């Protein structure tokens, strides 16, 4: 286990900001992806894990940026990327997501970089929106040593992610008409039999229901932070919040499996 920070509460995880000061920078020379912004804790008190976040088709860091400080303020290094092309497909997005985790591990060794020695490069996670969510699930299938995945409103050309052993939380948006839940997020969820998994559907949500500026940053943030802390840090203080079925009119559907209390 890698327990950092105080015992969480629902209200503290629903807050905009965790207990650590977040600083960030723009990656000078991106290696294998378009552009990156690294968010990191100054305060942590030990090495933190790293999470790479990828947007959807046509989209940029703006769509996913709110996760940077939301996670980093709880004890993570977060890299948000722009892809080489805004029109990159999920497999390319997965390659670039893993290239961003690689460059974070490089900057962990770069005496100049503000994140030298801050990363347990053995503790990494993947997130992303739509085709960047499908790319997160491809990253998890290809790299089972990843500790967690938390894609939002995912889309891929195949819904069969049966090889995934990585603890996977899928944020779904009930009224998604871009990647509908019944043909995308739910079949993807249903395919995984080998892992801790969870499915959280946002009541009334459009395809952007987990993007920067959304009307559920309390609940969605609580669940992303809790899932990453539980599985990236093996922090069982977070089992209650990671496995909980939220009592919320904001949630239209909840499913979970292999999520031990």
Curated annotation (Swiss-Prot):
Changing residue 129 to A: Displays decreased enzymatic activity on PET film and on BHET. Poly(ethylene terephthalate) binds at residues 57, 131, 155. It holds the Pfam family PETase. Changing residue 209 to A: Displays decreased enzymatic activity on PET film and on BHET. Changing residue 57 to A: Displays increased enzymatic activity on PET bottle. Displays decreased enzymatic activity on PET film and on BHET. Pathway: Xenobiotic degradation. GO terms for molecular function: acetylesterase activity; carboxylic ester hydrolase activity. Optimum temperature is 40 degrees Celsius for PET film hydrolysis. Optimum temperature is 30 degrees Celsius for PET (commercial drinking bottle) hydrolysis and BHET hydrolysis. Optimum temperature is 35-45 degrees Celsius for the hydrolysis of pNP-esters. Remains active even at 65 degrees Celsius (about 60% of maximum activity). Changing residue 63 to M: Increases activity towards 1-naphthyl butyrate. The active site is at residues 130, 176, 207. It is an enzyme of class 3 (hydrolase). InterPro entries: AB_hydrolase_fold, FrsA_esterase, PET_hydrolase/cutinase-like. Optimum pH is 9 for PET film hydrolysis. Optimum pH is 9 for PET (commercial drinking bottle) hydrolysis. Optimum pH is 6.5-8.0 for BHET hydrolysis. Optimum pH is 8.0 for the hydrolysis of pNP-esters. The enzyme is active at pH 6-10, has an optimal pH range of 7-9 and it is rapidly inactivated below pH 7.0 or above pH 9.0. Has potential for application in environmental remediation and biological recycling of PET and PEF waste products. Induction: Highly up-regulated during growth on PET film. Changing residue 208 to F: Displays decreased enzymatic activity on PET film and on BHET. Exhibits improved PET and PEF degradation capacity relative to wild-type PETase. GO terms for biological process: xenobiotic catabolic process. Changing residue 173 to A: Displays decreased enzymatic activity on PET film and on BHET. Changing residue 176 to A: Loss of enzymatic activity on PET bottle and on BHET. Involved in the degradation and assimilation of the plastic poly(ethylene terephthalate) (PET), which allows I.sakaiensis to use PET as its major energy and carbon source for growth. Likely acts synergistically with MHETase to depolymerize PET. Catalyzes the hydrolysis of PET to produce mono(2-hydroxyethyl) terephthalate (MHET) as the major product. Also depolymerizes another semiaromatic polyester, poly(ethylene-2,5-furandicarboxylate) (PEF), which is an emerging, bioderived PET replacement with improved gas barrier properties. Belongs to the AB hydrolase superfamily. Monomer. This is Poly(ethylene terephthalate) hydrolase.
